[PDB]
């Protein structure tokens, strides 16, 4: 309900952020908008906006139905065709007016950490593309635009656990795997 909406929106902003920070599209293809008390980068490109929108709309449906366990974003060199980086958002069911504010602060902190990953992440020196995966319940409804895939887990990867935020409904955290 409220939580699925909130979380889906977070996914939209996070995906944009990763795309900008990892240099998947050039800086000029984004603009600054104020969200979570931060300056967030968000695509101004109609094609990219539409791609992301389709994705996020489906994610919102799966959140509402409680079908989605994880959202995955993998980054891949167009040169070698191999996966260099894997961002994994874990969705778990948790076991007032103030709560909305708290959630906003927690999200802020997670986004700041996502940005701070720039301190240790290898520079991507080749143009990369990206793919998005979700882990879902077996009984989930799958639209034509989504299809079976292996998890594309990284081999010989470093992995970092980021912070989480919780609504009254969902606990969301982020992990990043990468190859040095």
């Amino acid at each position: 309900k409220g939580s699925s909406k909130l979380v889906s929106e977070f996914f939209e902003y996070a995906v944009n952020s990763i795309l900008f920070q990892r240099g998947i599209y050039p800086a000029e293809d984004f603009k600054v908008v104020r969200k979570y008390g931060l300056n967030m980068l968000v695509s101004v490109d109609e094609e990219v906006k539409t791609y992301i929108r389709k994705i996020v709309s489906q994610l919102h449906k799966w959140m509402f139905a409680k079908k989605i366990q994880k959202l995955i974003l993998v980054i891949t060199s167009k040169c070698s065709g191999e996966d260099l980086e894997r961002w994994q958002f874990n969705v778990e069911m948790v076991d007032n007016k103030e709560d909305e504010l708290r959630v906003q602060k927690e999200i802020q902190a997670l986004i700041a950490q996502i940005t701070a990953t720039v301190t240790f992440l290898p520079q991507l020196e080749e143009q990369c593309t990206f793919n998005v995966l979700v882990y879902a319940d077996k009984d989930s409804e799958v639209p034509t635009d989504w299809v079976d895939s292996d998890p594309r887990i990284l081999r010989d990867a470093e992995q970092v656990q980021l912070r989480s935020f919780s609504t009254s409904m969902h606990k969301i955290d982020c992990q990043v795997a990468y190859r040095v």
Binding site: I24, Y51, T129, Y135, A136, K138, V142, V147, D150
Partner: protein
């Protein structure tokens, strides 16, 4: 396994090609500093008003008299720990030594005997600032402790203004205000009587190790940020206004106001390892002098009590002396 893995079938859009005063560069003197630790979170150098340099090498504090050039080994910690900070009291009589284990030692410089050890920090004490007989200690826990060094129960108060390591700490020379910077990228400005921050500044995007009060203007404070920040901001500590700013180009490890001229010196870490002297005015800051000081980050610095000479130290194991004024 209840999990089904799905991938969005459509290929992501391919990216489109985008449309859019001469300064001596040679130090006057160089002193070997074997075993000096390379860590941004420590402060291992200080120069007293009695003209004594204290420097921490691993477990030991050595003192050098700038007049006589006599060297002596003032302190050696237990093997389970190391020196994280040294600070002289204002009169230069006492040396406070913060340790990696949270203890704070106080030594008498005359007899070189440890006067006392002060516990109560739960982790490394990386920064120290003296207000009269009050010594203030910052820690990796984010806590600040006020110690009245004359009394058996030393701690007279605590401030918790930081959610991670306290990096910079400085009392104003008149003791009315204290500034703290932190690894949480926060600057706190505290009135002496209050455990409530007078102002809290979030402008820095990295740790703030470098904190300095202007000696010719009471309320003027300089702070400078670490690697992801690189900025030096200036504040009016009465109104909370940001009155100046400059892009330093490198991680800022220290800021030292020139007592004799309207200028401020900064030392730097990644990438530049340099020493900069800036002219200060209401209109703004102009870079006067920029010179590579060390072969590694210039992590530690202290100004001579006559304000004419700046000592810097680094993990190239040189303690260097630069004549900055005259």
């Amino acid at each position: 396994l209840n999990t089904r893995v799905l991938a969005f079938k459509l290929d992501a859009p391919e990216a489109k090609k985008p449309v859019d005063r001469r300064f001596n560069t040679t130090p006057e003197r160089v002193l070997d500093a074997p075993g000096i630790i390379d860590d941004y979170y420590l402060n291992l150098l200080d120069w007293s008003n009695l003209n004594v340099v204290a420097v921490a090498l691993e477990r030991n504090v050595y003192v050098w008299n700038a007049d006589s050039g006599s060297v002596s080994a003032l302190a050696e910690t237990d093997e389970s720990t190391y020196v994280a900070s040294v600070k002289w009291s204002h009169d230069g009589s006492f040396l406070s030594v913060g340790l990696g284990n949270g203890l704070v030692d106080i030594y008498d410089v005359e007899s070189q005997t440890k006067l006392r050890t002060m516990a109560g920090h739960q982790a490394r004490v990386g920064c120290l600032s003296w207000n009269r007989h009050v010594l203030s200690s910052g820690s990796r826990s984010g806590a600040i402790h006020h110690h009245d060094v004359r009394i058996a129960n030393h701690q007279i108060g605590t401030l918790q203004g930081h959610s991670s390591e306290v990096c910079g700490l400085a009392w104003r020379s008149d003791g009315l205000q204290l500034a703290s910077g932190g690894n949480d990228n926060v600057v706190q400005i505290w009135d002496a009587r209050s455990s409530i921050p007078k102002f809290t500044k979030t402008n820095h995007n990295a740790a703030v190790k470098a904190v300095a009060w202007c000696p010719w203007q009471s309320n003027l404070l300089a702070t400078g940020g670490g690697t992801m920040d690189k900025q030096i901001h200036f504040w009016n500590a009465a109104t909370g206004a940001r009155v100046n700013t400059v892009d330093a180009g490198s991680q800022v490890t220290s800021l030292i106001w020139s007592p004799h001229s309207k200028e401020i010196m900064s030392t730097h870490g990644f990438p530049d390892n340099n020493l900069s002297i800036w002219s200060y005015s209401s209109s703004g800051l102009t870079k006067q002098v920029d010179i590579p000081a060390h072969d590694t980050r210039v992590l530690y610095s202290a100004l001579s009590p006559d304000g004419r000479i700046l000592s810097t130290a680094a993990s190239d194991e040189n303690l260097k002396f630069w004549r900055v004024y005259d």
